[PDB]
Design a protein around this motif. Structure first.
Motif, PDB file in Angstrom:
ATOM      1  N   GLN B  18       0.825  -1.201   0.000  1.00 19.46           N
ATOM      2  CA  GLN B  18       0.000   0.000   0.000  1.00 19.46           C
ATOM      3  C   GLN B  18       0.861   1.253   0.000  1.00 19.46           C
ATOM      4  O   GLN B  18       0.579   2.209  -0.729  1.00 19.46           O
ATOM      5  CB  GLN B  18      -0.935  -0.011   1.208  1.00 19.46           C
ATOM      6  CG  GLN B  18      -1.404   1.365   1.639  1.00 19.46           C
ATOM      7  CD  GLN B  18      -2.495   1.912   0.743  1.00 19.46           C
ATOM      8  OE1 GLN B  18      -3.650   1.499   0.831  1.00 19.46           O
ATOM      9  NE2 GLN B  18      -2.133   2.843  -0.131  1.00 19.46           N
ATOM     10  N   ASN B  22       0.455   3.032  -3.393  1.00 16.42           N
ATOM     11  CA  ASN B  22      -0.546   4.047  -3.058  1.00 16.42           C
ATOM     12  C   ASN B  22      -1.860   3.806  -3.805  1.00 16.42           C
ATOM     13  O   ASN B  22      -2.301   4.612  -4.625  1.00 16.42           O
ATOM     14  CB  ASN B  22      -0.001   5.451  -3.332  1.00 16.42           C
ATOM     15  CG  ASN B  22      -0.574   6.491  -2.393  1.00 16.42           C
ATOM     16  OD1 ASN B  22      -1.653   6.307  -1.830  1.00 16.42           O
ATOM     17  ND2 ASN B  22       0.147   7.589  -2.218  1.00 16.42           N
ATOM     18  N   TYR B  23      -2.479   2.670  -3.503  1.00 17.10           N
ATOM     19  CA  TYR B  23      -3.716   2.292  -4.173  1.00 17.10           C
ATOM     20  C   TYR B  23      -4.877   3.158  -3.700  1.00 17.10           C
ATOM     21  O   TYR B  23      -4.994   3.479  -2.514  1.00 17.10           O
ATOM     22  CB  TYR B  23      -4.013   0.817  -3.924  1.00 17.10           C
ATOM     23  CG  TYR B  23      -2.988  -0.110  -4.535  1.00 17.10           C
ATOM     24  CD1 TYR B  23      -2.791  -0.147  -5.909  1.00 17.10           C
ATOM     25  CD2 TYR B  23      -2.209  -0.935  -3.740  1.00 17.10           C
ATOM     26  CE1 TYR B  23      -1.856  -0.989  -6.472  1.00 17.10           C
ATOM     27  CE2 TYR B  23      -1.270  -1.778  -4.295  1.00 17.10           C
ATOM     28  CZ  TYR B  23      -1.098  -1.802  -5.661  1.00 17.10           C
ATOM     29  OH  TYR B  23      -0.162  -2.642  -6.218  1.00 17.10           O
ATOM     30  N   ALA B  24      -5.743   3.533  -4.644  1.00 17.89           N
ATOM     31  CA  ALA B  24      -6.832   4.457  -4.341  1.00 17.89           C
ATOM     32  C   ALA B  24      -7.853   3.856  -3.383  1.00 17.89           C
ATOM     33  O   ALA B  24      -8.346   4.555  -2.490  1.00 17.89           O
ATOM     34  CB  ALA B  24      -7.516   4.898  -5.634  1.00 17.89           C
ATOM     35  N   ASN B  25      -8.189   2.578  -3.547  1.00 21.26           N
ATOM     36  CA  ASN B  25      -9.147   1.917  -2.676  1.00 21.26           C
ATOM     37  C   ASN B  25      -8.475   0.711  -2.036  1.00 21.26           C
ATOM     38  O   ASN B  25      -7.532   0.141  -2.590  1.00 21.26           O
ATOM     39  CB  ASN B  25     -10.419   1.511  -3.444  1.00 21.26           C
ATOM     40  CG  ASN B  25     -11.150   0.346  -2.804  1.00 21.26           C
ATOM     41  OD1 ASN B  25     -10.914  -0.813  -3.144  1.00 21.26           O
ATOM     42  ND2 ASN B  25     -12.042   0.650  -1.869  1.00 21.26           N
ATOM     43  N   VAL B  26      -8.973   0.335  -0.855  1.00 21.10           N
ATOM     44  CA  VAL B  26      -8.323  -0.688  -0.039  1.00 21.10           C
ATOM     45  C   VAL B  26      -8.207  -2.007  -0.789  1.00 21.10           C
ATOM     46  O   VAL B  26      -7.254  -2.767  -0.579  1.00 21.10           O
ATOM     47  CB  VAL B  26      -9.086  -0.855   1.291  1.00 21.10           C
ATOM     48  CG1 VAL B  26     -10.568  -1.073   1.034  1.00 21.10           C
ATOM     49  CG2 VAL B  26      -8.507  -1.996   2.117  1.00 21.10           C
ATOM     50  N   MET B  27      -9.148  -2.302  -1.683  1.00 24.46           N
ATOM     51  CA  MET B  27      -9.179  -3.601  -2.350  1.00 24.46           C
ATOM     52  C   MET B  27      -8.499  -3.578  -3.712  1.00 24.46           C
ATOM     53  O   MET B  27      -8.882  -4.321  -4.620  1.00 24.46           O
ATOM     54  CB  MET B  27     -10.614  -4.103  -2.460  1.00 24.46           C
ATOM     55  CG  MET B  27     -11.347  -4.079  -1.127  1.00 24.46           C
ATOM     56  SD  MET B  27     -13.121  -4.351  -1.250  1.00 24.46           S
ATOM     57  CE  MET B  27     -13.264  -4.815  -2.967  1.00 24.46           C
ATOM     58  N   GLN B  28      -7.485  -2.728  -3.884  1.00 23.68           N
ATOM     59  CA  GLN B  28      -6.542  -2.868  -4.983  1.00 23.68           C
ATOM     60  C   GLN B  28      -5.268  -3.592  -4.579  1.00 23.68           C
ATOM     61  O   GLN B  28      -4.388  -3.777  -5.427  1.00 23.68           O
ATOM     62  CB  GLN B  28      -6.165  -1.499  -5.564  1.00 23.68           C
ATOM     63  CG  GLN B  28      -7.007  -1.046  -6.736  1.00 23.68           C
ATOM     64  CD  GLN B  28      -8.108  -0.106  -6.319  1.00 23.68           C
ATOM     65  OE1 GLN B  28      -8.756  -0.315  -5.296  1.00 23.68           O
ATOM     66  NE2 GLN B  28      -8.318   0.947  -7.099  1.00 23.68           N
TER      67      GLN B  28
END
Lengths: 57, 181, 49, 77, 124
Positions: B18, B22-28
């Motif tokens: 993460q 730096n994924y936009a939503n937690v489930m990336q």
RNA sequence: GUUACGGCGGUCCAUAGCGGCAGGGAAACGCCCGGUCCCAUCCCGAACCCGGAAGCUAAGCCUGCCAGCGCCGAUGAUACUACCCAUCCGGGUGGAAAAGUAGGACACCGCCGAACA
RNA sequence: GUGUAAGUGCACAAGGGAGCUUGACUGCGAGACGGACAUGUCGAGCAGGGACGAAAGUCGGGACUAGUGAUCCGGCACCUCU
């Protein structure tokens, strides 16, 4: 889980050269499992002109 | 109880990835999906017993009974006919997946003779890594005195990652002994 | 030869008959199948003769 | 010459056309494949033969890209 | 941007396809309407469809607060929903229906609610 | 009656599809958690099934905008053609394409149900 | 890809897989196609007794169209005929 289609499981102590008791399930029925090397001790995880100078200098 | 590799991935690998991407939503967050071990005998076209030896080797190493793959095409250069057993296959998911991954990474790979690392270039677009062994002696679930003929594998690790870079990052964080390029 | 016409009579007397063919090398043993018998009005198996 | 062999004509095709009134069981088309598919009140035979299941008039329609044959129940006098 | 399809796509497309494949043999009429069920992970829904006119004679679901008040499991909710659709059809005058399983396996909640409609007075 | 809502259907089943951009999770729709129970894998609770709701609209779903790719598509004229003239050449009356072009098109209609009144 | 030529079809699958099974039934058959005649072809539906299916339902061999021979004469089984 089908009863008779897969082999057995048992909590066995996995031993390396470092001296670590690794209490986790395994299929080997030795009770305690010993291995010589693992990730804890492995090394991966852990010119002709010169030869002339050696010979004559 | 939770397998140590799975617990590690849940706690620290996820936050590492993460921070890295730096994924936009937690489930990336890219995670492991399944592990498939393919052992294509090929030579079993003559004698069936080779497929049975492969079945026993796969069942011992993975821990679950392997599935025999039929030949879906007839060929004459390999004197192949439709329907005879050619190779085995196991799909590993979940806890058995994690256990097997732990066993392989911490025991099997270091046991390989003159092991120098696995190239990190074997990913394909989506970051699903696939390498291949040449024998089965690295695993101690088998017995050297028991075995009689080498049988290599094709371990493929399909992940949730979208790019090769994310896949190699996740595998390296997992503990894959990659080379350096 | 191969696929000869074969005769299967009703098991329970009356010698009621159906006919059909089969491979005599794929099925060397006598064929047994259950079928309607007109006189009995019932489904009994039929033994190849 | 090798040639000279042919089969008999099978007289396939449409037997009753659009608007024709038919009785139940009346053969509508004689076809090999399903060039026309059965519609409402129309059945399909062993040799892909269409026939009427109820009296009425023949109507040729298209359903989801397939040509179909239907029977319209003409009004009783 | 994910590389392939999501699992939700596979599930939804497969369910729609295998509902369509069974709608070939099942179609509802005025006196014999088609009872189509839609099941989610949280709820279950039923309607009574007259396919010739494309209408709905009766409907029921676990969304309704009266059936939400029961404390039973998902199977209990489906059973009560089946009772609701049965008595609504009774109030609708429909006696015989054809059970449309909506592309789901006839088991578990759907089988429980279909049975529940059956012993409540719907012959199907 | 209304809502960026969910289902069940339609139409000579793309004018509807695909692709791009910008949004959203009220109930729903999902992804999701787990395999104790019904049930399941030609191996794998991946799928099917069951039990729940911690998280999430990143996807699905649907909303608005793009003619971009596909798709639909005239009128006119021409090809062709029935009949009749015509010694051949050709002509008259009637029918009339395909391709192409102008253009259309980022669907429309129906019945229930959610949330709101 | 569909057992097999070609054609018409089939992705809704008629193509691939799995479980149970013998409808590769008996008595019939409104109505038809095709036809010199003899042949040939389709057929809803009714009854009996069944298979599969929760059920609706489907099943009177095979995606379809080839895989065949009239009459006479004789053989075999059964019949409450003579």
């Amino acid at each position: 889980m089908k009863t008779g289609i897969h082999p057995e499981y048992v909590d066995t102590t996995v031993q390396c050269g470092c001296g670590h008791s690794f209490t986790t399930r395994s299929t080997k029925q030795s009770g305690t499992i010993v291995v010589e090397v693992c990730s804890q001790c492995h090394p991966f995880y852990t010119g002709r002109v010169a030869r002339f100078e050696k010979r004559y200098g | 109880a939770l397998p140590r590799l799975k617990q590690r991935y849940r706690e620290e690998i996820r936050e590492a990835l993460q921070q890295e991407f730096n994924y936009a939503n937690v489930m990336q967050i890219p995670g492991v999906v399944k592990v498939v071990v393919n052992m294509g005998v090929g030579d079993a076209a003559r004698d069936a017993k080779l497929i049975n030896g492969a079945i026993n080797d796969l069942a011992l190493i993975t821990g679950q009974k392997p599935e025999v793959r039929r030949a879906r095409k007839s060929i004459a250069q390999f004197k192949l006919r439709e329907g005879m057993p050619i190779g085995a296959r196991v799909t590993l998911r979940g806890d058995r997946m994690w256990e097997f991954l732990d066993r392989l990474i911490s025991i099997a790979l270091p046991r390989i003779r003159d092991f120098r690392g696995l190239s990190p270039k074997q990913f394909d677009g989506t970051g699903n890594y696939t390498f291949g062994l040449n024998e089965q002696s690295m695993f101690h679930e088998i017995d050297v005195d028991s075995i009689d003929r080498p049988r290599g594998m094709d371990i493929t690790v399909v992940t949730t990652a979208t790019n090769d870079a994310e896949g190699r990052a996740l595998l390296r964080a997992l503990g894959f002994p990659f080379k350096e390029n | 030869d191969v696929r000869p016409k074969i005769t299967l009579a009703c098991e329970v007397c009356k010698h009621r008959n159906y006919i059909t063919k089969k491979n005599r090398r794929n099925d060397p043993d006598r064929l047994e199948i259950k079928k309607f018998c007109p006189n009995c009005g019932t489904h009994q198996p039929h033994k190849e003769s | 010459s090798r040639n000279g062999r042919d089969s008999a004509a099978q007289r396939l095709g449409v037997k009753r056309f659009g608007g024709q009134v038919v009785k139940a069981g009346e053969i509508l088309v004689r076809q090999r494949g399903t060039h026309f598919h059965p519609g409402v009140n129309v059945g399909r035979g062993g040799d892909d033969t269409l026939f009427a299941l109820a009296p009425g008039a023949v109507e040729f329609g298209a359903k989801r890209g397939r040509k179909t044959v239907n029977i319209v129940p003409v009004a009783r006098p | 941007k994910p590389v392939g399809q999501n699992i939700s796509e596979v599930r939804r497309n497969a369910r729609l396809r295998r509902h369509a494949r069974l709608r070939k043999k099942v179609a509802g009429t005025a006196e014999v309407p088609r009872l189509v069920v839609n099941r989610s992970a949280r709820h279950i829904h039923v309607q009574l469809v007259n396919d010739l006119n494309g209408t709905t004679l009766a409907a029921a679901s676990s969304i309704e607060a009266d059936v939400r008040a029961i404390d039973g499991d998902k199977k209990a909710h489906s059973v009560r929903v089946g009772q609701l659709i049965a008595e609504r059809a009774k109030a609708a005058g429909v006696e015989t229906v054809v059970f449309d399983r909506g592309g789901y396996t006839y088991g578990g909640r759907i089988a429980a609610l279909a049975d529940a409609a059956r012993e409540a007075g719907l012959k199907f």
